[PDB]
Specification:
TIM Barrel; hydrolase; 20 helices; binds beta-D-xylopyranose; about 25% helix; Complex Xylobiose Glycosyl hydrolase; homodimer; alpha/beta; Rossmann fold; Immunoglobulin-like
Amino acid sequence: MELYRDPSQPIEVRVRDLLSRMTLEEKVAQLGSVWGYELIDERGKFSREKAKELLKNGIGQITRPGGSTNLEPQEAAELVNEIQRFLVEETRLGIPAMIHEECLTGYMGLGGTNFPQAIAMASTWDPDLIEKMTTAVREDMRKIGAHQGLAPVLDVARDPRWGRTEETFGESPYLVARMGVSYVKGLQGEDIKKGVVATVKHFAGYSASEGGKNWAPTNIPEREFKEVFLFPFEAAVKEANVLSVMNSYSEIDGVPCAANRKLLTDILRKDWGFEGIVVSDYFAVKVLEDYHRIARDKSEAARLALEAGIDVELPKTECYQYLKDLVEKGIISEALIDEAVTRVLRLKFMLGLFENPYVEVEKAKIESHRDIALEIARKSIILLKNDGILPLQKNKKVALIGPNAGEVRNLLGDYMYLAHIEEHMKSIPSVLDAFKEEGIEFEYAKGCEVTGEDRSGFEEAIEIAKKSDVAIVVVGDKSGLTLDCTTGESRDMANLKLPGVQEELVLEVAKTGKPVVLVLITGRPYSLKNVVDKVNAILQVWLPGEAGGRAIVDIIYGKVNPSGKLPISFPRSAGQIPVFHYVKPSGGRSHWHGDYVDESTKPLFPFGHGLSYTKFEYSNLRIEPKEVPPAGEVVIKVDVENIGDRDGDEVVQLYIGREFASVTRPVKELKGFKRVSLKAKEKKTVVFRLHMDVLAYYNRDMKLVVEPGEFKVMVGSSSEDIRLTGSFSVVGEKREVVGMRKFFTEACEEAAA
Amino acid sequence: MELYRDPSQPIEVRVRDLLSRMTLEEKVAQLGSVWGYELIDERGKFSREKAKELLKNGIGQITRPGGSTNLEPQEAAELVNEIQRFLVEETRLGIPAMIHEECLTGYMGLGGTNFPQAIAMASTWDPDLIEKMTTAVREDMRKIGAHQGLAPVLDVARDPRWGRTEETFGESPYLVARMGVSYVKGLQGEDIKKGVVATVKHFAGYSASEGGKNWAPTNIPEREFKEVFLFPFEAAVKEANVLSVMNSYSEIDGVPCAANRKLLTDILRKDWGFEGIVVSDYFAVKVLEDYHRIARDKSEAARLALEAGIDVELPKTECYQYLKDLVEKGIISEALIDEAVTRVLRLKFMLGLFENPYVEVEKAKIESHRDIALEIARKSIILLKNDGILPLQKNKKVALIGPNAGEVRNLLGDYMYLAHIRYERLKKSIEEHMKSIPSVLDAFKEEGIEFEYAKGCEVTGEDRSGFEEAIEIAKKSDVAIVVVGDKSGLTLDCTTGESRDMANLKLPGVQEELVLEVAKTGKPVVLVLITGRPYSLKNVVDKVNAILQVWLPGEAGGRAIVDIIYGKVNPSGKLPISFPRSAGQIPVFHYVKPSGGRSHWHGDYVDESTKPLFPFGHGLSYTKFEYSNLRIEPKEVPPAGEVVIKVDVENIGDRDGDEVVQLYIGREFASVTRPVKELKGFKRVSLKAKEKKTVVFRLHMDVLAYYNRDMKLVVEPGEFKVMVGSSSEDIRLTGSFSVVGEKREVVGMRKFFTEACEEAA
Ligand SMILES: O[C@@H]1[C@@H](O)[C@H](O)OC[C@H]1O
Ligand SMILES: O[C@@H]1[C@@H](O)[C@H](O)OC[C@H]1O
């Protein structure tokens, strides 16, 4: 029995033993990948014939054995068992494969629940609920033999033109970091042998491209890069022990992230102590040549990516095969191959793959998590505006108008299987279905398509509105990767107008003088400047997946009290970009008239905005001690009372302001929050335990510091709807924050007195 | 006498002698300033009473003795002579004042020519002509006793939302640097005792504020900062020997430029060898407290600005008076005061102020340079579009429509005196002096055109009252000339200028609707934009027959527009900045990386092209130019070698005209990503009909240097692409040459510019 096969030996001993036994060819194969679809026949069964060519020397990863085959869970599990049996039994060393799938909004394959999009997850401000979700996704993935999910997007979004806004947790480094750590914790176990490797992406800056254009340069200076952009990845590595990172397609200031050793090694591995694998974004190595034009051939692209710190080329071996030739010709040292292979082998051993690489096909049927999807959908929907029309009485005749009332497909995000892809059909409930099921009397008129300028349908929509009590206009996006989609990866929107003639559809329906409820089923903020004052209520419904219809109707009729809060600012117009809550004293205004000539510098809806069908009263602000030394702790308490007549969740938000630091600081920035459930007339105390570590920022010399001085405390229902204000002082000498530090405020509830 | 008063002693000896004689109070006064208006009575005469308080211990600078007093040139000269006599005769040490004025578009005071705005200057692509202009401004300034002009703005503009776009030379670091060096050379001349100190501003990044908003953070990473924003300042310091720099109001990534020693000292003085004075932007020191909130009081703001490298607080001593208290209390070293005073005194001696601080009031009448202003206006106007309607025949009946056809005030930029300065006596005096400037209406009458004028709308507001009159005059005419765009200045009623940022880039008020209404008559339409920024023309471009871009042209504007419309002048201006299709497209610039200027993998936005409506270098002619016979010699050059690029250009059309020949350089397979194409050379060439000439670009490899992964300035072996054309998109001839040898680190002084000339074909 070779040491690497012996389960009593420590993993480092098994890794060293296996590495010492491997040829150069076997080493380079562990840094590569193959598509699931390249290993099946036309009957969807494992093809030994194809495996003999592609798997002869073993392999790092199988890419999307479920997601790329259109196989049902048990068929996918059978394919993976067969791939593994070939590797374990018909290769010299019998190294098993790691399998990855997409899983952002749930396992991206047939039979997997479509959870609401990441921007919806963020809008819950409920990290525990996102952890519950990814704990369910973990079980789904392990059933089909999948070890790695291309997991939370930790890109901080302040440019809603960008088609991937829907995949982010929004504009706030704090909220993004807090959701990212809960997401990673749910996916990964305490013990990864019983869990799924999370992949934080896209490291780093990919959400701040020139003009919001996909893959365009992300030109971010160092303090902003560290405090925004890197912060959530830092928290995922150090607090959540994330085991994979995927690079950004974009250059930072001349350097493609896939060729940046200062980023993928010096920051990620050396500064932060990351011990997992870096996987390329798909084709990110090859396009160092094709797109960025800094690699003269595939072998130079391979050298740049390996030197940078990419361990696995995805989604298929292309450049990394030439690492063999680079060593044989003495261009690179085999020792650098060994370093990457060591990280891959370590993770394979930790995942339990050498003890048992197989799953029980009989237990591989994936269960529905519609219950969890529905709780996210119900908590994620945001009431942007309500003049009193909502909630509606069930006896009102409804004119249900718009492309996103009827569609079902337009409820789905860019990484939901049925959008991303006769096969496990769209038996997903529509909004129209949810209205029927709720017993509402309505007529449906489509009014218009998502795209185009055809106004044919306007007259039917107008006529249905005139014969109704209330018009419910359901407009917004089709999310995906193709030209006909208005949002999603590769679908960037310069001017932030609702797609096609949807805005004109709303204004035409409004001209009937009937009450209008505007339901935005969208992947990004749109400019509502021209419709906001012409409609009575506005619901923001971030691409909600399969639970969307029921949640929208539940909220419209007050069976659910809306509790979602914006995780990203809604610009008045594209020309206002960017707008975010944590501007410096000189940000978020034009000096000395405050506004643009043509436009407010304030967003239409601010960060943390979301209304309720009840009222919350904040009282009794306590900040103790009042003076703390630079590594001390302050305890901030507020009482919150539901003074209205409906049960509701309030999201209590802590903003911290700093002036007279050695650098300029945000006038206010989110540093804590708590979703608190309050029955009508119930009062509770929300408590924020704020360690000074959490308030650390980079000084003029790029040191992480806490400086003596006064911090402003602002607690409220949004970044603008601040209810209580106070301060505390840090007293003592400037502190350099070195090594491990706290990233998060600790937020809980107490009985009020 | 004392060594400092002895003109046979070297300046360094005179400086050391004077410094050793000065009290702490006299030293700190040399780092301060006083407004001209603080030293006059109500009649605009020098007030000894006021001077005894403000000038008792001497002073660094007098701020705008002409620009802030509303005095005529000879009255301003008399005030400055009196200020100087007080300082020379009634202070202990008799140190004279340095005087500064604004002078971007000419001396900013009564009696000064209003030259076209800087964005117009850039549109000429004629650096020699801008040098001729600032040589004239130099004589104007020296007549009234003014020693320093706050002029060449070297901010690189790629965000047309920004109200100060009009003050820049546009988007191209190369074109900005090339115009900046000519601007500075004209103002300074070879010996500064006979010249005027140029002040490059605003150091550094002030044109790239968050959302195009005035003073908002300018968050620029290091390679882009060095190659785009710093480059023109670097060329101005090292090639043009500029003697003053003014800081930016903005923070870079948490650090206000006024408090940034790494910027104002480590880059400017240590890395580049700048020997002149850094002057604050107005109140830039005080607002370290009031705006940025990083100084707890005026004394801490003073310490941050002095440590950073600001020598003179403008426009009035406010924080810098507390430097005295900071030394007396042992918070800062007097040695740091001494270093700043040394720079101020050195410049005063070099200006000749200790030998003769006075001017002849009798010779202080400033001459008109309308001739130079007219050459700039005629060379700056850009023909964006022409289906053949231009030039017009003089016998066509013209409907002259729009707020900028009739309003002479809207010809003026934000630093032209009559626009900038706005008791009841000041209002009357502006309205009085305003009547002197020819209007566009005046130019049409003078040319003998048959026209009716309708002011279809105001610049701002939503009043469509005037539309009907405008439409009716259009229907009775052969051609509608619609003249629309900006009112430039600093107040709420202005649409462009400092503090007037435009988020959505729509023509102001209902001007766009006025254009579309006139177009609906089915009459031919010539659209004339009199503007300080690119506007979105997306909704009008395809509805009009011709478009002229007329960057705020000053007093020569009317005549130049009429000359061009009737073909007395062949238009030859080229865009120095990209015209976005929409605000949501921002930024668009010609020198994007392979991954810039597109969304991957469909190329375009869902709703919009990623390409500008009009690209960098765009400008049509009433003739056609044919490019042939591209030569690049040698084909292989070592990393400090030279390539000679030659093209023949023939005027194949029917009219004499100027072509601006543009050299773009591309680089792939560097160790960093490089622009697909970037302007590295240009030449304005005059061609008679059927005349052919050879344009020659002498390109030293120094000019192509870029920053590598380790932040070294390098030339790397490989291929450089040569693209010569009539715009950044209208490329006529391409080829390439190779750099062969070992990677070169470009150390110390290097060439910044291609050498461009003409020879016989
Ligand atoms: O997010 C990644 C995306 O950028 C790429 O196209 O495909 C792989 C994904 O994991
Ligand atoms: O351009 C400068 C401007 O920024 C400031 O407002 O006043 C002084 C000028 O020189």
